[PDB]
């Protein structure tokens, strides 16, 4: 029942379709999201942002909580999965999830090896919401409500430098994004 998330063409986002997640702020605001690697723990791959605003990164696909709903809506728990075109460097999943607290940095990082579906305590770390960010794009929000009796973090996602890369983590200042159709989705609006 919530309002649909829109892409840069003004079209409602469709579950199951590929979208680049691109910073709503260009220049020093960077480009799109992608799979990255840390040298101390190369798998699972982490979520990073490309520094070049003309690099849209790797597309993601959204999976709704209600698998019957074709539309991606604001403020509704969903799973997010990178869909790389090239061969896998890691055998962990490319599904986003919130990591365990990192004492070395004070951060709750967005990483991968998440799980699709099965809303439950077991999958709590894999559920994200998309929220409107004022009048400038959207933000990711980790505040799952799939388990009413579970204590959870409830916080927006920002971007933070670590080891020379731009990572995503829970933080006080959300980073805004827009959604751009990947080539496979552009085919869906043309005959």
State the binding site: 2-3, 11-12, 40, 55, 66, 99, 102, 104, 113, 162-163
Q: Which residues are annotated as a binding site for Zn(2+)?
A: 2-3, 11-12, 40, 55, 66, 99, 102, 104, 113, 162-163
In Å, how far from its chain's centre is CA 137?
A: 14
Q: Please report whether residue 17 would count as binding Zn ion according to CB under 5 A.
A: no
Assign 184 to helix, strand or coil.
helix
Q: Please report whether residue 70 would count as binding Zn ion according to CB under 5 A.
A: no
* From 88, 120, 122, 163, residue interacting with Zn ion (rule: CB under 5 A): 163
17 or 156: CB nearest a copy of itself: 156
Q: Please report whether residue 68 would count as binding Zn ion according to CB under 5 A.
A: yes
In Å, how far from its chain's centre is CA 150?
A: 22
Q: Name which of Zn ion, a copy of itself, none residue 81 binds, using a CB cut-off of 5 to 8 Å depending on partner kind.
A: none
73 or 97: CB nearest a copy of itself: 97
Q: Please report whether residue 170 would count as binding a copy of itself according to CB under 8 A.
A: yes
| Least distance in angstroms from the C-beta of 102 to Zn ion | 4
Q: What is the 3-state secondary structure (H, E, C) of 99-148?
A: CCCECCCCECEEECCCCCCCCCHHHHHHCEEEEECCCCCEEEEECCCCCC
Q: Please report whether residue 191 would count as binding a copy of itself according to CB under 8 A.
A: no
- Sign of dihedral through CA atoms 120, 102, 109, 41? negative
Bin 14: left if φ > 0, else alpha if -120 < ψ < 50, else beta: beta
32 or 158: CB nearest a copy of itself: 158
Task: Work out whether strand 78-82 and strand 60-64 pair parallel, antiparallel, or are unpaired.
Answer: antiparallel
What are 140's strand-pairing partners? 130
* Residues in contact with Zn ion by the rule CB under 5 A: 2, 11-12, 40, 55, 66, 68-69, 92, 99-100, 102, 104, 113, 163
């Amino acid at each position: 029942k919530n309002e649909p998330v829109l892409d840069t063409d003004g079209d409602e986002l469709r579950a199951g379709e590929q979208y680049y997640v691109v910073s709503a702020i260009w220049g020093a605001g960077g480009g799109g999201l992608a799979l990255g690697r840390l040298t101390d723990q190369k798998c699972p791959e982490i979520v990073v942002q490309r520094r070049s605003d003309l690099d849209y990164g790797t597309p993601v696909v959204f999976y709704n909580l209600d698998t019957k709903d074709d539309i991606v809506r604001r403020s509704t728990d969903l799973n997010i999965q990178f869909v790389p075109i090239r061969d896998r460097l890691c055998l962990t999943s490319t599904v986003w999830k919130i990591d365990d607290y990192d004492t070395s940095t004070g951060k709750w990082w967005v990483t991968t090896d998440g799980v699709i579906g099965n809303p439950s305590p077991q999958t709590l770390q894999s559920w994200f919401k998309i929220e409107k960010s004022g009048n400038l794009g959207y933000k990711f929000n980790f505040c799952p409500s799939v388990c009413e009796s579970c204590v959870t973090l409830c916080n927006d996602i920002g971007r933070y430098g670590h080891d020379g890369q731009i990572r995503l983590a829970l933080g006080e200042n959300a980073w805004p994004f827009v959604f751009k159709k990947a080539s496979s989705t552009i085919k869906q609006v043309v005959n």
